[PDB]
Design a protein around this ligand. Structure first.
Ligand SMILES: *[C@@H]1O[C@H](CO)[C@@H](O[C@@H]2O[C@H](CO)[C@@H](O[C@@H]3O[C@H](CO[C@H]4O[C@H](CO[C@H]5O[C@H](CO)[C@@H](O)[C@H](O)[C@@H]5O)[C@@H](O)[C@H](O[C@H]5O[C@H](CO)[C@@H](O)[C@H](O)[C@@H]5O)[C@@H]4O)[C@@H](O)[C@H](O[C@H]4O[C@H](CO)[C@@H](O)[C@H](O)[C@@H]4O)[C@@H]3O)[C@H](O)[C@H]2NC(C)=O)[C@H](O)[C@H]1NC(C)=O
Ligand SMILES: *[C@@H]1O[C@H](CO)[C@@H](O[C@@H]2O[C@H](CO)[C@@H](O[C@@H]3O[C@H](CO[C@H]4O[C@H](CO)[C@@H](O)[C@H](O)[C@@H]4O)[C@@H](O)[C@H](O[C@H]4O[C@H](CO)[C@@H](O)[C@H](O)[C@@H]4O)[C@@H]3O)[C@H](O)[C@H]2NC(C)=O)[C@H](O)[C@H]1NC(C)=O
Ligand SMILES: *[C@@H]1O[C@H](CO)[C@@H](O[C@@H]2O[C@H](CO)[C@@H](O[C@@H]3O[C@H](CO[C@H]4O[C@H](CO)[C@@H](O)[C@H](O)[C@@H]4O)[C@@H](O)[C@H](O[C@H]4O[C@H](CO)[C@@H](O)[C@H](O)[C@@H]4O)[C@@H]3O)[C@H](O)[C@H]2NC(C)=O)[C@H](O)[C@H]1NC(C)=O
Ligand SMILES: *[C@@H]1O[C@H](CO)[C@@H](O[C@@H]2O[C@H](CO)[C@@H](O[C@@H]3O[C@H](CO[C@H]4O[C@H](CO)[C@@H](O)[C@H](O)[C@@H]4O)[C@@H](O)[C@H](O[C@H]4O[C@H](CO)[C@@H](O)[C@H](O)[C@@H]4O)[C@@H]3O)[C@H](O)[C@H]2NC(C)=O)[C@H](O)[C@H]1NC(C)=O
Ligand SMILES: *[C@@H]1O[C@H](CO)[C@@H](O[C@@H]2O[C@H](CO)[C@@H](O[C@@H]3O[C@H](CO[C@H]4O[C@H](CO)[C@@H](O)[C@H](O)[C@@H]4O)[C@@H](O)[C@H](O[C@H]4O[C@H](CO)[C@@H](O)[C@H](O)[C@@H]4O)[C@@H]3O)[C@H](O)[C@H]2NC(C)=O)[C@H](O)[C@H]1NC(C)=O
Ligand SMILES: *[C@@H]1O[C@H](CO)[C@@H](O[C@@H]2O[C@H](CO)[C@@H](O[C@@H]3O[C@H](CO[C@H]4O[C@H](CO)[C@@H](O)[C@H](O)[C@@H]4O)[C@@H](O)[C@H](O)[C@@H]3O)[C@H](O)[C@H]2NC(C)=O)[C@H](O)[C@H]1NC(C)=O
Ligand SMILES: *[C@@H]1O[C@H](CO)[C@@H](O[C@@H]2O[C@H](CO)[C@@H](O[C@@H]3O[C@H](CO)[C@@H](O)[C@H](O)[C@@H]3O)[C@H](O)[C@H]2NC(C)=O)[C@H](O)[C@H]1NC(C)=O
Ligand SMILES: *[C@@H]1O[C@H](CO)[C@@H](O[C@@H]2O[C@H](CO)[C@@H](O)[C@H](O)[C@H]2NC(C)=O)[C@H](O)[C@H]1NC(C)=O
Ligand SMILES: *[C@@H]1O[C@H](CO)[C@@H](O[C@@H]2O[C@H](CO)[C@@H](O)[C@H](O)[C@H]2NC(C)=O)[C@H](O)[C@H]1NC(C)=O
Ligand SMILES: *[C@@H]1O[C@H](CO)[C@@H](O)[C@H](O)[C@H]1NC(C)=O
Ligand SMILES: *[C@@H]1O[C@H](CO)[C@@H](O)[C@H](O)[C@H]1NC(C)=O
Ligand SMILES: *[C@@H]1O[C@H](CO)[C@@H](O)[C@H](O)[C@H]1NC(C)=O
Ligand SMILES: *[C@@H]1O[C@H](CO)[C@@H](O)[C@H](O)[C@H]1NC(C)=O
Ligand SMILES: *[C@@H]1O[C@H](CO)[C@@H](O)[C@H](O)[C@H]1NC(C)=O
Ligand SMILES: *[C@@H]1O[C@H](CO)[C@@H](O)[C@H](O)[C@H]1NC(C)=O
Ligand SMILES: *[C@@H]1O[C@H](CO)[C@@H](O)[C@H](O)[C@H]1NC(C)=O
Ligand SMILES: *[C@@H]1O[C@H](CO)[C@@H](O)[C@H](O)[C@H]1NC(C)=O
Ligand SMILES: *[C@@H]1O[C@H](CO)[C@@H](O)[C@H](O)[C@H]1NC(C)=O
Ligand SMILES: *[C@@H]1O[C@H](CO)[C@@H](O)[C@H](O)[C@H]1NC(C)=O
Ligand SMILES: *[C@@H]1O[C@H](CO)[C@@H](O)[C@H](O)[C@H]1NC(C)=O
Ligand SMILES: *[C@@H]1O[C@H](CO)[C@@H](O)[C@H](O)[C@H]1NC(C)=O
Lengths: 223, 242, 449, 126, 126, 52
């Protein structure tokens, strides 16, 4: 089974640098890139970069160019990241992710089906609506996300204190283990995720995603 | 087994030209001819000509040999056996006897003795050649009336009065309410202006549960009117139900 | 009036499939001999007068990203590399401690050596007395251990020396399909490589595609027609590489100003290792020239095609590689037998808004390589005598786009690579394999009594 | 006119029936890396003899064209004589009949030359 | 009724003559360890073309059944018409005729289509 | 039949380079037990009585 084992979180001071590791197992490390994405509470998730273990190729987000360094150890299948010149803005939970489609022939990076446990580091478009959603068990939640570019859209669910789980991809296709209660729809630029017969497990925060871009999130809580 | 959509109805003064389009979809545009057949109220059905999208070869009638130009765009592949294309035609030196409906038709077969034969046809584009200028319509709301007291039904609508030239399209709630809609043809007044009426039969119990907005569109004058039909009727035979 | 079935044999009916493709490589290339250079040994000679039949009215859909010929060529070149290295001399007793020192030169401290003068033991023809011989290795080939060094591939895999008889010269190889199959070719001037093709033709054998293994910069490729071409499986996806194909080739000159000596030390009985002797002349480093004007016009012609997909009024900034292995961060290629890794920081250092000499690039040289991300087989490239000079064509790029933008209207592109299949996708985009099914039934007014 | 191999691929079936002798002609065509073509041309001749066996066990033997005593089932895309040979390509036709190709093949190899030739054996003894 | 491949093996020869198109259909069927099947399907097609060559040089060509102008020699197990097709299986019959199969083959390939076709060569010129 | 190896073991990856690597047996975590196999007495009785 595909398993991403991350090193724990840490507390840094401003100006210092941080280093994180993520050991992949259960698949051929060279087949597809590993990604690094940071999630700050109440903030749009930020994709930091990807690395292809084959050759060690890397691609960094603009915001981080010159500060971040991604490498890997093919023998131990371990991906390494370093971030320099830490400022208060860098406080967040850092994840390593792997896409769902990952064979020898080809892959698709942005359907993040595999996530590490995350590393809490403290240092001291897609329009998603509504911001919050207070509903009772049994009702139906309809979260919306407006795009401007179009292309395989995904929906993720994050439970309080757990790593996000892939719920839907391609805007209308359910992932493994997702029951019929979750359904996706699309009209023009608009995307709707509908969750029928709410139950305790469904409550959390939901994100729409188009490649590296994420929505602002919708917190669905029990009332 | 496709679909041909033509451009909207236009109004042109005699002496000018007009270009009527005909977009096709659902089949290979280059595998069939594109015939153009018109129909007036004085000369009957008249075949104008055809054009083969593959080569560009054209065959016009001697009557339209010196004032009709047929053009076709390149094929835009959709699937391996279906596609979408567009054919145009430009008729110059318009006269009073050119007022009528112009159709575009798909050929019948690819090979044989009836390859160009018009098989799949369009919806047609009305062409009016007149000097009289374009006059905007006057939409008036038609108050709901009682249709069946024991049945509990009524009928409300809109009145398109004094417009020129034809046609005028009327929809309800941006095309949401379509059942029970009866649009009657217009009347040719002594002045030369047309005027039609649209009426939809609706139950009387629907008041604050559905918004009635009749959408009258008159493209020749580039004007759209959205009237809010008041649900409160004045018919004494219907007020008993309320 | 009632129709009747009739069997037709030989109808133009084909379906997309995958089969076993064979080779073809002219007849003059076989006269190159030199103990079977590269692959051409038992390859079928190419047909002197190839036939290309333009299928009128035919619109066929191609897919360069889901094409099996790329995977077949890749596995073919890999098996070629193994069969070419199986009968060569294995350098198993070469991981001995290397007492290395600086090369004989005169400062400064910023020259960082690069070349190491290693002395070590060696087994002679007899299994008794050893052999105190010295060689000259590059810093990328050695690594110190606690001056005593060692080969950098000791605790990775074995090592075999490439035989000096064969060559790594990319020669045109025509891929052909057996009877019953055919190769469809898109002959439109603007085929950006996916979807229906208006002008499709059929062929038995493709044109001469030279297997040039290189990264970042596509060398010796097919020039594009009219405007330069930009191909991507998913443009909005920045994780998928962007293959760029040029219209006008960019003249590049690479040289090795270190005309070298081949010492033939004898690790008998039979085997013999080719070490690097002393350097005759000056201690210079390999370098590559790119004509400044040509690079400017090519970049200005590409950025005009990039604005057709990322918005008309946007800023396109070029930056070099972000990091990783040497094969991805540098322009890796082969020239004269040596494996160069050139600094491509002077080519991708620009910022284009909406509206006379040569650019030299520092090139490193490595002898012990592990291409195709292969573990188990390390090949030692034997030294090459004489100054090596080579002039090639830059005919395309392999770019990657930076992600997580959201804010900002500029887009930054960096050189990429790694997967060598992309190097084959830049030539097999206009070909696809189909199988012929000549059996077709059809109704007609035909029967017997 | 000779459009060549696979020439009349986009033409109607009636027009493509004139090019039968062209795709049939180029259908057979007369250390590792050398076995790559060997195993391919062996599968090539196995595919050829496979089609020749189907063409032989049916009421044809003589290649190109042959007629049969099989009623055209309307369920197999009920089209007209002039709507097939003058309005459809062979690829488009095979795309529709792909469901019933194996059924017709079964009605051709079994129902015909197994009952017809035995009938001739009964008709040739007298 | 369709007993399948090798169905009427225990049935009489007359009954087994109805299943000819079944055993003929499944007779051709369309790093080491992979050449194991290659050399086998090559011997499979060589066995097929061997039987097709014998079936062609004789007065048959058309498969399944064909008649010949050869008198049945009584020494080849003198049985009756109704004692062969209605009282003997093909395995039991081939067990008896195994001695004379090669002799009959010689009387079929040589005595017939070499003298018959030349006779037609003399009969077709006038 | 149930067979068990009550000696959950450690794999030491000692390196006989260059390239090759031998997997030795490290220390045993837990109790020193020997592998064993169980056969249900009743099933074995009915099977033997059915065979005889
Ligand atoms: C190589 O070059 C060629 C050019 O020769 C090229 O082909 C064109 O590529 C361009 C991209 O540059 C295309 O233009 C885009 O088309 C995208 C896809 O359109 C399909 O999908 C639409 C959505 O379908 C879902 O939604 C509907 C409704 O919810 C749903 O019912 C369906 O089930 C489906 O799930 C679909 O509606 C559209 O259908 C219309 O369009 C075709 C024509 O394209 C038309 O014939 C139909 O009749 C129908 O009217 C089509 O099926 C697309 O998403 C995109 O539009 C989005 O982005 C733009 C901004 O960029 C916005 O304006 C817009 O609001 C959307 O969000 C755009 O239209 C074009 O489709 C290609 N042509 C063909 C024939 O495929 C390649 O891309 C080039 N390749 C490379 C590598 O460069
Ligand atoms: C690509 O697909 C297109 C269709 O989109 C094809 O084009 C049509 O091809 C058919 C043939 O099947 C055409 O039909 C014939 O047109 C002929 C025109 O004749 C003049 O031109 C030729 C060529 O220059 C001259 O040599 C001749 O001298 C004439 O000057 C006619 O002669 C035909 O009518 C005669 O034959 C038919 C039977 O074939 C009879 O029924 C008639 O009564 C008459 O005797 C026929 O009309 C058609 O013209 C083509 N289209 C266009 C636009 O021209 C292609 O065939 C196809 N590609 C391929 C490779 O097949
Ligand atoms: C790479 O590093 C290696 C060593 O690791 C080098 O190879 C050595 O190079 C040195 C030169 O600096 C060699 O030293 C020379 O050896 C010659 C061999 O002569 C033999 O025979 C004579 C009798 O005729 C004996 O006396 C002698 O001891 C030897 O057994 C000597 O003849 C040379 O002497 C000459 O040069 C010196 C220089 O100062 C003069 O003073 C003398 O008078 C005389 O003219 C000299 O001693 C050494 O032998 C090499 N070793 C091996 C194993 O090859 C490379 O030089 C180095 N390369 C670079 C580029 O740095
Ligand atoms: C790159 O580095 C290599 C290192 O090997 C150099 O190769 C040597 O270059 C020198 C100089 O050119 C060559 O020396 C020449 O030897 C000739 C005679 O050689 C033959 O005869 C001897 C016996 O006498 C044999 O042992 C040998 O095998 C040959 O059969 C001389 O005739 C030459 O002198 C003539 O040419 C020079 C110019 O080269 C003129 O200046 C002279 O006046 C005279 O006309 C010369 O001395 C040596 O043979 C080469 N060795 C090898 C193995 O090739 C390259 O020169 C160097 N290149 C550069 C560009 O730096
Ligand atoms: C058979 O013998 C093998 C010998 O290898 C035993 O395997 C080891 O078992 C121990 C005990 O379970 C494991 O120790 C555990 O380590 C966890 C953390 O490991 C991660 O983090 C470290 C860095 O801190 C990394 O180096 C490491 O690679 C991992 O990524 C702890 O969290 C565990 O504590 C938790 O679980 C135990 C129960 O296991 C609870 O009692 C604790 O309260 C706590 O909840 C634990 O300490 C060790 O990692 C294993 N090694 C390997 C290689 O697998 C088997 O356990 C043994 N089995 C039996 C049945 O005897
Ligand atoms: C055998 O050949 C191998 C080549 O395939 C060598 O492997 C590489 O060796 C280099 C060092 O020369 C490593 O790079 C360094 O990695 C360290 C990692 O530090 C962390 O890990 C160490 C060890 O657990 C720990 O002590 C530290 O505290 C850290 O937690 C970096 O810190 C260095 O800056 C440097 O990057 C490579 O990672 C390693 N692997 C690969 C795939 O390159 C190997 O060294 C050779 N064997 C010997 C004995 O030298
Ligand atoms: C052989 O070695 C000598 C000794 O190092 C080399 O001389 C060195 O040359 C460099 C380059 O000119 C000098 O660096 C200088 O530093 C000063 C510092 O202020 C700076 O102002 C200069 O512009 C220059 O960068 C260095 O001082 C000098 N060293 C000595 C001892 O003179 C020499 O170049 C080498 N080659 C030859 C052929 O001599
Ligand atoms: C690569 O080298 C060739 C050969 O020297 C260069 O071509 C020369 O260019 C100059 C200037 O235009 C001409 O005067 C010479 O006649 C050319 N010689 C040949 C043989 O073509 C070329 O410019 C060099 N390119 C780069 C990028 O360095
Ligand atoms: C082998 O182990 C299995 C699993 O422990 C035994 O099956 C159990 O048998 C007991 C007694 O009948 C039941 O109560 C359990 O529910 C069974 N568990 C399972 C998973 O089947 C089995 O009896 C053992 N056999 C032997 C020969 O040791
Ligand atoms: C990416 O490519 C796939 C495969 O053709 C396609 O389905 C998808 O629509 C593409 N995405 C975009 C944004 O064009
Ligand atoms: C060269 O010599 C200097 C001076 O002793 C030393 O510091 C350095 O490590 C040596 N090697 C290189 C590669 O510079
Ligand atoms: C080999 O290296 C050793 C290092 O201990 C050295 O003593 C010896 O002289 C060298 N040469 C030979 C021939 O052993
Ligand atoms: C790219 O250039 C930068 C300087 O801008 C340098 O630090 C880095 O090492 C270069 N990277 C590669 C891959 O050459
Ligand atoms: C490549 O060149 C750039 C610019 O000179 C430099 O910053 C970088 O360090 C160089 N990279 C290497 C690997 O030398
Ligand atoms: C490479 O480009 C040069 C410059 O025009 C040209 O002379 C040469 O023929 C090209 N090589 C090719 C296309 O193989
Ligand atoms: C003809 O088609 C119908 C319906 O698909 C089917 O019932 C019938 O069996 C078919 N005829 C033959 C001979 O298979
Ligand atoms: C023609 O097609 C129709 C409709 O499928 C069908 O009723 C008729 O039998 C067909 N006729 C011929 C001659 O194929
Ligand atoms: C093929 O058969 C399937 C299954 O009955 C059916 O869904 C499909 O419509 C058929 N297609 C054609 C072209 O007859
Ligand atoms: C038939 O067999 C008998 C006895 O074995 C023999 O006398 C005769 O020559 C044979 N004739 C033929 C034609 O085989
Ligand atoms: C039966 O066999 C005998 C002996 O050869 C022969 O006399 C007789 O004609 C045969 N009868 C039939 C009916 O075949
Ligand atoms: C086969 O021939 C041998 C040798 O003449 C003889 O012994 C045997 O009886 C024959 N068998 C049959 C079935 O004719």
């Amino acid at each position: 089974q595909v398993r991403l084992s991350q090193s724990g979180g840490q507390m840094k001071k401003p100006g210092e640098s941080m280093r994180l590791s993520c050991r992949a197992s259960g698949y051929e490390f060279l087949n597809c890139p590993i990604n690094w994405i940071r999630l700050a509470p109440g903030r749009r998730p930020e994709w930091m970069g990807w690395l292809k273990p084959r050759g060690g190729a890397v691609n960094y987000a603009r915001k981080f160019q010159g500060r971040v360094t991604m490498t890997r150890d093919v023998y131990s299948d371990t991906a390494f990241l370093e971030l320099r010149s830490l400022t208060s803005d860098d406080t967040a939970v850092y994840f390593c992710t792997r896409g769902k489609y990952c064979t020898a022939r080809d892959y698709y990076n942005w359907d993040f089906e595999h996530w590490g446990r995350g590393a809490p580091v403290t240092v001291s478009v897609l329009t998603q609506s509504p911001a919050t959603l207070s509903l009772s068990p049994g009702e139906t939640a309809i979260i919306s996300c407006r795009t401007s570019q179009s292309g395989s859209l995904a929906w993720y669910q994050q439970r309080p204190g757990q790593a996000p789980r892939l719920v839907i991809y391609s805007g209308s296709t359910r992932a493994a283990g997702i029951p019929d209660r979750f359904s996706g729809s699309r009209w023009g630029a608009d995307y709707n995720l509908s969750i029928s017969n709410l139950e305790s497990g469904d409550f959390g925060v939901y994100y729409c995603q188009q490649y590296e871009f994420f929505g602002q999130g919708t917190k669905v809580q029990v009332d | 087994q496709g679909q041909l959509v033509q451009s909207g109805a236009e109004l042109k003064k005699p002496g000018a030209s007009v270009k009527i389009s005909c977009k096709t979809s659902g089949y290979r545009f280059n595998f069939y001819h594109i015939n153009w057949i018109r129909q007036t109220a004085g000369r009957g059905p008249e075949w104008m000509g055809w054009i083969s999208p593959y080569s560009g070869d054209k065959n016009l009638a001697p009557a339209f040999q010196d004032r009709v130009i047929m053009t076709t765009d390149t094929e835009v592949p959709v699937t391996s056996f279906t596609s979408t294309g567009a054919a145009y035609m430009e008729i110059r030196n318009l006269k009073f006897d050119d007022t009528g409906t112009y159709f575009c038709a798909k050929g019948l077969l690819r090979d044989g003795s009836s390859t160009w034969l018009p098989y799949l046809w369009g919806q047609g584009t009305l062409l009016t050649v007149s000097s009289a200028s374009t006059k905007g319509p006057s939409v008036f709301p038609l108050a709901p009336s009682s249709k069946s007291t024991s049945g509990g039904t009524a009928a409300l609508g809109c009145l398109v009065k004094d417009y020129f030239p034809e046609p005028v399209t009327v929809s309800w709630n941006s095309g949401a309410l379509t059942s029970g809609v009866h649009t009657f043809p217009a009347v040719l007044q002594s002045s030369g202006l047309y005027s039609l009426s649209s009426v939809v039969t609706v139950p009387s119990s629907s008041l604050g549960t559905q918004t009635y907005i009749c959408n009258v569109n008159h493209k020749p004058s580039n004007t759209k009117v959205d009237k809010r039909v008041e649900p409160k009727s004045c018919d004494k035979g219907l007020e008993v139900l309320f | 009036e009632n129709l009747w079935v009739t069997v037709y044999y030989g109808v133009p009916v084909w379906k997309d499939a995958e089969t076993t493709l064979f080779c073809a490589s002219d007849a003059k290339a076989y006269e190159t001999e030199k103990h079977n250079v590269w692959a051409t040994c038992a390859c079928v000679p190419t047909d002197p007068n190839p036939q290309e039949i333009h299928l009128e009215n035919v619109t066929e859909e191609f897919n360069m990203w889901k094409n099996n010929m790329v995977e077949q060529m890749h596995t073919d070149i890999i098996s070629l590399w193994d069969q070419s290295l199986k009968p060569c001399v294995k350098l198993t007793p070469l991981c001995v401690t290397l007492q290395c020192t600086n090369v004989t030169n005169n400062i400064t401290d910023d020259m960082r050596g690069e070349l190491k003068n290693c002395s070590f033991n060696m087994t002679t023809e007899l299994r008794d007395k050893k052999q105190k011989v010295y060689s000259l290795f590059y810093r990328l080939d050695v690594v110190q251990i606690n001056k005593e060094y060692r080969l950098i591939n000791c605790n990775t895999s074995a090592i075999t020396q490439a035989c000096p008889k064969v060559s790594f010269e990319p020669i045109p190889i025509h891929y052909c399909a057996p009877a019953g199959f055919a190769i469809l070719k898109c002959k439109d001037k603007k085929f950006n490589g996916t979807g229906p093709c208006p002008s499709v033709s059929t062929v038995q054998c493709t044109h001469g595609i030279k297997p040039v293994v290189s990264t970042q910069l596509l060398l010796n490729g097919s020039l594009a027609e009219e405007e330069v071409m930009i191909r991507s499986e998913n443009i909005t996806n920045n994780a998928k590489n962007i293959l760029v194909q040029f219209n006008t080739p960019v003249q590049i000159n690479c040289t090795r100003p270190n005309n070298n000596t081949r010492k033939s030390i004898r690790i008998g009985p039979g085997q013999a290792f080719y070490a690097t002797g002393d350097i005759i002349g000056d201690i210079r480093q390999a370098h590559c020239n790119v004509s400044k004007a040509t690079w400017n016009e090519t970049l200005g012609k590409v950025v005009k095609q990039l604005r057709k997909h990322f918005g008309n009024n946007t800023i396109i900034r070029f930056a070099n590689s972000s990091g990783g292995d040497l094969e991805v961060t540098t322009h890796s290629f082969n020239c004269g037998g040596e494996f160069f890794y050139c600094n491509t920081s002077g080519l991708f250092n620009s910022t284009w808004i909406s509206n006379n000499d040569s650019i030299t690039l520092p090139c490193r040289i490595k002898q012990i390589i592990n291409m195709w991300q292969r573990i188990g087989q390390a090949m030692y490239a034997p030294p090459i005598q004489g100054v090596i000079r080579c002039v090639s064509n830059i005919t395309g790029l392999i770019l990657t786009r930076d992600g997580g933008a959201n804010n900002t209207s500029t887009e930054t592109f960096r050189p990429g690579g790694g997967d060598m299949r992309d190097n084959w996708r830049s030539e097999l985009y206009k070909y696809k394999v189909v199988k012929i099914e000549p059996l077709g039934v059809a109704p007609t007014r035909c029967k017997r009594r | 006119v000779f459009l060549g191999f696979l020439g009349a691929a986009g033409s109607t079936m009636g027009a493509a029936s004139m090019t039968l002798t062209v795709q049939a002609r180029n259908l057979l065509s007369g250390t590792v890396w050398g076995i790559k073509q060997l195993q391919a041309r062996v599968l090539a001749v196995e595919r050829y003899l496979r089609d020749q066996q189907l063409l032989g066990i049916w009421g044809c033997s003589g290649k190109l064209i042959c007629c049969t005593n099989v009623p055209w089932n309307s369920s197999w895309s009920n089209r007209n004589l002039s709507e097939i040979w003058d309005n459809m390509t062979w690829l488009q036709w095979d795309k529709e009949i792909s469901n019933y190709t194996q059924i017709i093949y079964g009605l051709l190899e079994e129902s015909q030359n197994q009952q017809e030739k035995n009938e001739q054996d009964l008709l040739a003894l007298d």
